[PDB]
Write a protein that binds this DNA or RNA. Structure first.
Ligand SMILES: [Cl-]
Length: 343
RNA sequence: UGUAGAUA
């Protein structure tokens, strides 16, 4: 029986097993649930660098077999941690040629994310130079999009320009990404971390198909990120459009959240535009909104976010309609969360 | 009364 089967039998019998004992058994240990846990715990608890170094040659020699293994990927990740700096460059060399495949794999992509989280900028750039070859497909991939998001989070903006240029590669790319469950997160991460020179054309593409993106199940989060991370002009354009089309935006499932974001993030003069649209003298828009399955939440958010003077206009506009509003689906509950304002 | 993203 080999070392692993012996060790798996009676762990207590081998309480003094060390990393340097593993030798050629590293691959078998690292792909085993028990063996991988042993390796990880020794790598975390050992005070002996030479013990830790002793399995590194076998990790390198078997890197392609370990990186997308259910248990082996954790062993590889240990050597990208702080404290294993001396091994980072050799380990990147061991995986670099297949990074374009690893980015799409569910275990290997965690190795790549760990590397980008920890290693120095020259090694990050080396990894990204391979991601370059598969970046469009990577952005829409359940696994690859997490590698791309980690890159945007952890690498200086000038070195993710190739990702921004992929968002801008054709007319429809930003739309395609914003309505994709994985691509939309890449767009959001870019809006959070890229420079305003990088985000300006990205935001410009979003504006061109604003209405469609704003009511998309994923795109509405992209638009909320524009409100938060865009320019004052971006918010003015958005608030002007929302105010001019307030009933339509408020009564649709996903775009209703965009109005709420405007009210949470907007300055008083933006809140004034939304309030004025809602109260404009059919019954006032704010009354119609309170009867609606989504817009009633937008009205509640308005009351919670605007100035006392702005609430005063809303109260004076709504109060005559309170009898008939009590009758609608949930209308008793809706006026109940507003009772504090109407007394 | 209303929304989202890969491991033992
Ligand atoms: Cl266009």
């Amino acid at each position: 029986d080999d070392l692993l089967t012996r060790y798996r039998a009676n762990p207590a019998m081998m309480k003094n097993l060390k990393l340097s004992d593993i030798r050629g058994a590293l691959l078998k240990f690292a792909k085993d649930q028990v063996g991988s846990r042993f390796i990880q715990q020794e790598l975390a608890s050992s005070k002996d660098r030479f013990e830790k170094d002793s399995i590194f040659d076998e990790v390198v020699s078997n890197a392609d077999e370990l990186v997308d293994d259910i248990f082996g990927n954790y062993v590889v990740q240990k050597f990208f941690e702080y404290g294993e700096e001396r091994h980072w460059a050799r380990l990147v060399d061991a995986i670099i040629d297949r990074v374009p495949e690893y980015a799409f794999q569910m275990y290997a992509c965690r190795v790549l994310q760990k590397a980008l989280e920890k290693i120095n900028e020259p090694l990050q750039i080396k990894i990204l130079s391979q991601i370059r070859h598969v970046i469009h497909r990577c952005m829409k991939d359940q696994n690859g999009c997490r590698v791309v998001q980690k890159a945007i989070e952890k690498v200086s903006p000038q070195y993710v320009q190739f990702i921004v240029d992929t968002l801008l590669e054709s007319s429809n790319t930003i739309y395609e990404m914003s309505v994709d469950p994985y691509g939309c997160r890449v767009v959001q991460r870019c809006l959070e971390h890229c420079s305003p020179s990088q985000t300006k054309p990205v935001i410009g593409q979003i504006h061109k198909r604003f209405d469609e993106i704003a009511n998309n199940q994923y795109g509405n989060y992209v638009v909320q990120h524009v409100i938060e991370h865009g320019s004052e002009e971006d918010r003015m354009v958005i608030v002007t459009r929302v105010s001019n089309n307030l009933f339509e935006f408020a009564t649709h499932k996903y775009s209703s959240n965009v109005i709420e974001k405007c009210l949470e993030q907007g300055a008083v003069y933006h809140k004034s535009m939304i309030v004025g649209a809602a109260c404009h003298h059919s019954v006032p828009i704010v009354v119609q909104m309170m009867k609606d399955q989504y817009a009633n939440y937008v009205v509640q958010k308005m009351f919670d976010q605007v100035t006392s003077e702005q609430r005063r206009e809303l109260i004076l506009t709504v109060r005559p309609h309170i009898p008939v509003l009590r009758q609608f689906p949930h209308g008793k509950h809706i006026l109940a969360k507003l009772e504090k304002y109407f007394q």
